[PDB]
UniProtKB/Swiss-Prot annotation, chains A, B:
Other noteworthy facts: Present with 3530 molecules/cell in log phase SD medium.
GO biological process: extraction of mislocalized protein from mitochondrial outer membrane; protein hexamerization; protein targeting to mitochondrion
Gene from which the chain derives: MSP1
Principal EC category: translocase
Family statement drawn from the similarity comment of this UniProt entry: Belongs to the AAA ATPase family. MSP1 subfamily.
Name of the protein in its database record: Outer mitochondrial transmembrane helix translocase
Residues on Cytoplasmic side: 2-290
Protein EC: 7.4.2.-
Assembly, per entry: Homohexamer; in presence of ATP. Interacts with PEX3; leading to inhibit the translocase activity.
Function per UniProt: Outer mitochondrial translocase required to remove mislocalized tail-anchored transmembrane proteins on mitochondria. Specifically recognizes and binds exposed hydrophobic surfaces of mistargeted tail-anchored transmembrane proteins. Acts as a dislocase that mediates the ATP-dependent extraction of mistargeted tail-anchored transmembrane proteins from the mitochondrion outer membrane. Able to unfold protein substrates by processive threading through its central pore.
């Protein structure tokens, strides 16, 4: 990949004094430079509500890293998450972000890494954070982040990757951008590291139907008094993560009745404190979702 | 501590079949049972805006752990943070929370642990999560969490403690409650693990003055056009974390002028892209804080 290295050397003259190692050369082919990206923000319609926040969170820290590294009150986010329903253009938006900020772009395909290296894959993940640190400003892009790193070997890679992710905290020039269609399926350990999340677009009635179906797939619903279609039709403006909060509020309403009757039995001397009794959290109803619809504004 | 163990055995009869180890017996003295706590919510005035959220986040998961462990849509928070200005009663509120929910209460004094054990302190921290798991429901209380675990030895304890903190995620019966007067000084790795944060009370004008003073202690302020007292007097309703967002917005306004003039110089061919020029992020002014005052509502 001597041809790839010669171009990045001419862009920043200080790069010719840098030496890669054996594992970093193999990943050098996976690097996309800003002049190779073909898409801009102009080619993407509907970014008007996001342009301002995208600059403050992504574009400015990459173009202007001296300010965030010199100012205590200014910090670049550890990771940025772009999410929306299927067909919102999350992958092209990340490429536009890379070109709009003049930063390099590396797209991790963990399956492509794992299938080629197996047990040696952690050295490829490690040599990729160092390579992104050398080719700064560099955007580490993780598409379909909900499935990123799913047995016991895949758990070793997670603990290693999170250590590397927290390592670039003191680094305004390296950014991790995640993209997903299933925000509710993102590992909680990832979401803790994505402080900035950008809603690309809203899900339609059919998409909100499927989101609620997956959210309630292991929850006991009422055989008579439950209506998925009515709930999905009256949740316009709800995102995937807003619908999860609606299901959380619905289950909370039933759990309140549960603990109210449980206290009534204990405070009336009916049952023991540790007594297992007839108390089972009741199946959810349509009213629990209709009566918790204002969770969207919280 | 055979006397302490006999009381906890009579409260829950299944506990007499449990065996502690050598390190867990030493911590058994540090356990406070609900009948030893003397304070309730009635003895604390001003909790009316917080009572509802305190139940959903702390009291209900501890009294009703079978529901959160049986319901996928219901999860107990990993950690809860109680914060407010000095004199808000954060420590007594955590004790009221423990008594109101009938859970055991262990107060970690890391200095008391470190001073007694030094290098063996990690085994005491480890034997304390297991002891809280056995004496469930148990509240792990961390007061003055901003100073919790601050050289290289104190970093080993952090990585160990965070591993234990993430270990009790699958545990509705063990909760970590942190308290602080300096929320802006909390380690970011802690804040990522405190999803629920309860504002006990608001800081007064004098307290908002000191908060802004510490926040801006390393930031270049204008010699003529800066007024701390005016900003502190007109930030009523701002918390400690809201004042940090105000300082973040102020520094953002100056950084916008910086990157605007930087682009003007590059787009006019005046300077090189990597040219170090006369561009220095300008000292903050009073107007940057007055013009970013609506960050409180975001």
């Amino acid at each position: 990949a001597s041809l790839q290295w010669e171009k990045l050397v001419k862009r920043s003259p200080a790069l010719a004094e840098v030496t890669l190692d054996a594992y970093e050369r193999t990943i050098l082919s996976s690097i996309v430079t800003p002049d190779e990206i073909n898409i801009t923000f102009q080619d993407i319609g509907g970014l008007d509500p996001l342009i301002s926040d995208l600059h403050e969170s992504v574009i400015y820290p990459l173009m202007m890293p001296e300010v965030y590294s010199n100012s205590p009150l200014l910090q670049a986010p550890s990771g940025v998450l772009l999410y929306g329903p299927p067909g919102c253009g999350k992958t092209m938006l990340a490429k536009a972000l890379a070109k709009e900020s003049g930063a390099n772009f590396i797209s991790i395909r963990m399956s492509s890494i794992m299938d080629k290296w197996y047990g040696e894959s952690n050295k490829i993940v490690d040599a990729m954070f160092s390579l992104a640190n050398k080719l700064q400003p560099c955007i580490i892009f993780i598409d379909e982040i909900d499935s990123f790193l799913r047995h016991e070997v895949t758990a070793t890679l997670k603990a290693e990757f999170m250590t590397l992710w927290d390592g670039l905290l003191n680094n305004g020039r390296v950014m991790i951008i995640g993209a997903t269609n299933r925000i509710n399926d993102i590992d909680d350990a990832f979401l803790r590291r994505l402080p900035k999340r950008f809603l690309v677009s809203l899900p339609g009635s059919d998409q909100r139907y499927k989101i609620l179906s997956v959210l309630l797939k292991d929850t006991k619903l009422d055989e008579d008094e439950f209506d998925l279609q009515l709930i999905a039709d009256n949740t316009k403006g709800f995102s995937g993560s807003d619908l999860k909060e609606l299901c959380r509020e619905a289950a909370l309403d039933a759990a309140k009745e549960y603990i109210k009757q449980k206290r009534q039995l204990i405070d009336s001397g009916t049952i023991d404190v540790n007594d297992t009794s007839s108390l089972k959290i009741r199946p959810l109803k349509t009213k629990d979702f209709t009566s918790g619809l204002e969770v969207l504004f919280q």
